[PDB]
Every structure is written in structure tokens, then in C-alpha cells.
Amino acid sequence: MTYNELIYMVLDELKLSSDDSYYTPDHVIFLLVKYRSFLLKQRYSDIKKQIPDSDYQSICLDLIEVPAISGEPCEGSSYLRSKNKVPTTMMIGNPRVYPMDFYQGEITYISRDRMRYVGYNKFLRNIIYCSKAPDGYLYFKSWNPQFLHLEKVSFNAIFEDAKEASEMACPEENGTICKLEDKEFPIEDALVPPLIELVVKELRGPEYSPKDEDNNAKDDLPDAR
């Protein structure tokens, strides 16, 4: 399914059909993305399971060489980092940074706090690592000075904000999809009926709540206007 097929099933179930309604598709895009990450953390974090190829989104990155702090020599070897910030992964899938081909190359996405002590073992001095720093960028570090010649990597994981990873999505064979709603929503079909139900239940109560309708410099909500 797409984004458009998922929003318009919450809107038709909540019967939000008029232009002049209090709730938008922009309300539902917020809630379908927050209740996607709510729901995957509920299922896939107690005991380990098979996560399907539906929950993953591959995003394309452009790497630049950045220094450690500033331009000084006595600091440390320079890193690579993305041109743009990276959406935050969840800790439930198999994150995988791959060089534009999934089945090839070992670039190892590890945590931000492992990577400050990594690469000291003499057989792991060719392995490129990744992590998302508190800057929000994906920084790379390797003891092999050939790692600075990367120009483009792709990142396949279960990201928290599915809205964020759908802006950085890879270009297709045809071309990059201009509209967001024509992109694919990343959740399995086995989880669409609770994802719709939790978003429909979230807004249906607030759908019939009274509004402060009279413009009279006064709160008309205790009178249920």
C-alpha cells in the first residue's frame, strides 16, 4: 500500500470528508507515523522475532570528509559524514549500510557509544563503521585511509519517523516521486488493521468534541459551544 491509501482509509472511517473540517490529512500523517513506531516497538522488543521486508526503508546518503573538531593537526583522523541528518533507527531490525548494492560490502552500523573505542583489533582495520552522533549526522570511522574515498552509501533499517526516511528515499528507475502521499508506507499488512484502529480511536473522540465557536473574547468551552 501507499501513503495515500492509508490516510484515506482513516479519513473515510472517521468520515472527514469536507474541506472545512477541523482535522486534515496532516493530522493523520502525524498519527500514522507515530503509531507505526509505537506499534513496532510493542511487537518486536519483548522477544526477538522475524521482521519482514515491509518495515524497512532504504535511504541514500552523500558523504563528505569532515574533521574531528576543527582544522587542527593534533586532534585525530578525519571522519566521513552525510551531507544531511539521518532519521533515527529503531533497535529491532537489522540495520545495514550498503554501498548502493545490498548483497556486497561490509560497512558496519554500530552504536554511537561503541564506536569511540573501535578498530583496534588488527583484523578489523579495514572495516568501515557507522553511527548516528548527537549531531544527528551519520559519522564514519575506519583505520584504513581508503575509506575516505566513499561518495555514496545507502542505509536500510527500521526508522522511527517514516515521514523522515521517505524524504531521503532513493530515486527509482523512473524517477524520484515528487509527492509524499504517492510513496510507500513502511508497515506490514499484518499490522495495518491495528494501526488504523489506534489512529481512528485517537481522533474519533476529539472529532466530536465541542469547539470555542463564538468570537466574544471569552472561553466558550465550559459551555460546550
Binding site: 522477544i47 480511536k201 485517537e202 476529539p206
Partner: protein
Amino acid sequence: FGSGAIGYEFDNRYLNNQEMSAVAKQRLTSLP
């Protein structure tokens, strides 16, 4: 009103705790 993000995670956590107790009774018996 209506909102179901706290009753859902409480009922999930209940079935987790009924699962961790049930799976801790999985014994592979010895002395045969």
C-alpha cells in the same frame, strides 16, 4: 473520549508477563 495508546501497551505487557511465566516452565527432562 477516545484514545488507546496506554491500554494497548498495558495489555501487551500483561500478555508478555503471562508469556515469560509460561515459557519459564519449558523443561527438557533428563535422567532416562
